[PDB]
Amino acid sequence: GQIKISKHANECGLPTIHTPSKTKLQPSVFYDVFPGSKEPAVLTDNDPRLKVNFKEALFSKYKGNTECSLNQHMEIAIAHYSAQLITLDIDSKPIALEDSVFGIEGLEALDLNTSAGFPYVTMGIKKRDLINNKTKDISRLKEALDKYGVDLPMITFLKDELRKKEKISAGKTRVIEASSINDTILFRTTFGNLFSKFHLNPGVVTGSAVGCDPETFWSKIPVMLDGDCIMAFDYTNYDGSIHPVWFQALKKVLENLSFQSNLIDRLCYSKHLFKSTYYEVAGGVPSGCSGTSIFNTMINNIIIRTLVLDAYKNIDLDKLKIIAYGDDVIFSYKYTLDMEAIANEGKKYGLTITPADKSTEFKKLDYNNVTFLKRGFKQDEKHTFLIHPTFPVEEIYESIRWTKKPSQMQEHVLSLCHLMWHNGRKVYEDFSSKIRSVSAGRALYIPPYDLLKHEWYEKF
Numbered sequence: 001g002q003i004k005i006s007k008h009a010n011e012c013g014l015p016t017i018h019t020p021s022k023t024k025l026q027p028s029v030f031y032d033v034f035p036g037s038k039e040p041a042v043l044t045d046n047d048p049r050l051k052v053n054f055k056e057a058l059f060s061k062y063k064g065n066t067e068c069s070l071n072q073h074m075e076i077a078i079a080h081y082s083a084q085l086i087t088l089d090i091d092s093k094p095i096a097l098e099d100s101v102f103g104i105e106g107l108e109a110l111d112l113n114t115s116a117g118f119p120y121v122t123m124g125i126k127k128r129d130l131i132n133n134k135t136k137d138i139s140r141l142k143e144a145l146d147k148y149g150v151d152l153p154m155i156t157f158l159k160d161e162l163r164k165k166e167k168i169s170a171g172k173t174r175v176i177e178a179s180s181i182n183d184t185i186l187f188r189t190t191f192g193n194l195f196s197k198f199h200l201n202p203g204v205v206t207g208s209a210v211g212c213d214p215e216t217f218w219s220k221i222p223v224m225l226d227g228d229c230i231m232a233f234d235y236t237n238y239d240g241s242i243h244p245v246w247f248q249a250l251k252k253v254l255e256n257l258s259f260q261s262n263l264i265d266r267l268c269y270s271k272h273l274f275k276s277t278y279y280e281v282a283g284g285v286p287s288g289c290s291g292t293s294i295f296n297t298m299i300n301n302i303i304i305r306t307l308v309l310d311a312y313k314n315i316d317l318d319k320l321k322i323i324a325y326g327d328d329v330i331f332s333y334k335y336t337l338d339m340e341a342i343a344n345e346g347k348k349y350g351l352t353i354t355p356a357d358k359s360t361e362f363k364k365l366d367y368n369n370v371t372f373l374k375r376g377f378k379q380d381e382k383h384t385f386l387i388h389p390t391f392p393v394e395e396i397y398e399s400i401r402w403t404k405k406p407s408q409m410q411e412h413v414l415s416l417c418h419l420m421w422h423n424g425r426k427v428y429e430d431f432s433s434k435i436r437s438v439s440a441g442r443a444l445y446i447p448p449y450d451l452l453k454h455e456w457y458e459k460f
C-alpha cells in the first residue's frame, strides 16, 4: 500500500474527526491471579511507554508497492479458482435493501453496534437511529442514503486492545478502517449472494473458513485437506502489502461469476480520514470493513495458487487444496512441497511471508503442530474423528487479567471457558480453581467439564 495523497481534511471538504485517546481496559479482579505481560495498546502520542514516534508507526503499514504486472501464472490461478466457484451456481443478481439490513440465509443481519461511519459519527447518529429492529422500519436509513450518497471516506479508528510489550514501545497498535453504513449497504446489495454462498459452504470449493464454527469445522478440515503435505505460513502485514494486481485478479474472478467489478476499486484505491488528515492509498485492503473478510480470502486463494506455480513448474492445482480466512491459510498437496520455496516467490510481489507461528525456520507440519485461526488440532481419545480446536493457554490467561466493563466478568469468563476446555480436562479444572481462588471468582458460574463435553457431542 502507498499513500498517494495526504492533506488537511478541511482542504478536501471534510471535518476533523475526534479520536478517543484513552483506553477502556483496566486491570481485572484476576490480574494478580494469573500470569501475563500484555498491556493496553498505545492510543496517543502522549504515552510514557513509547520509544518511537507514534504517527510514523501507524502509517508504516503503507510502505509502497513493487513494480509488477498481472502475469501468466496469475491468469491460470484466476481461471482455476473461478471454475471451482462456478460450481456453486451463485446468484449474481443483487439483493434487496431490507435483506441487506435484516439478513438472509447465509448472510446474517447487519450489526447495529458497530459505528455507522462518516458522516454519522460527526453528529452523534448511530445505526439504531437509522434502523429500528422491533418495527423493522428503515425510513431514516433510506433518507440517509439518498442524502449523503455513496463512496464516502473510511474513518480509521485505533484498536483499543491488549498487545505484547514489544508492540507498545514500537507504537504497533492496529487500525480499523470503518466504512460508512451507506457503503457497506451498497456492497451487501451487490455482493450479498456471494457472501451468503461462502458462509454456507466453508471448505475446499470456496477455499474459505469465513463464518465457520471451529467446534464442528475442525473435524471436517482433515478430510477436505487430504494429501500428505500439510502446509501453512504467516504473512507480515497482509492487508497493507497487497499490490493492486491482486485486486485486478479479484475483479476478473468476480466477472467470471457475472458480478460487476467496479466496487473493488474503492477498496484498492481507497479514501481515508484519520483525525485532521484526509488520505488516499493505492494497494492494501482496508483492515476490517465492507465485506473485507471474503475478498481477502479470495485474494489469498489467488496468491497461494500463483506462488506455487512460480515455485513448481509441474503442479496439479486440482490437488492443491486450500482453506483461508483472510490472511490466515492452511493448505495441502498430494506430495511434499517446500514451504520456504513458495514463500520466496512472494517477495517480487511485495509479500513478506515467514514460517508459521513465529517459528524460526520453515519446519515440516502435520496435525500435531499445525495452527489455523490460532487453533491446534487434537482428536477426542474415544471418537478420534471428532477433533478439538485447541486454543493457546497463554492467550486465555492474558485476556482474563483485563476488562473494559467489570460488570460483565461472567460473560468474559464464559467465553474463555468455551475456548479452554478443548485443551483438556486437567487444564480446565486448573483454570477453574484459580478463578475460584478469589472472592469475585467464587461468585461466578463455571460450566462443569461434562456439561461442555456433551453440549459439544450433542452438536455433531
Ligand SMILES: [K+]
Residues within 6 Å of the ligand: 001, 267, 268, 269, 270, 281, 282, 283, 284, 285, 286
Ligand atoms: K487501499
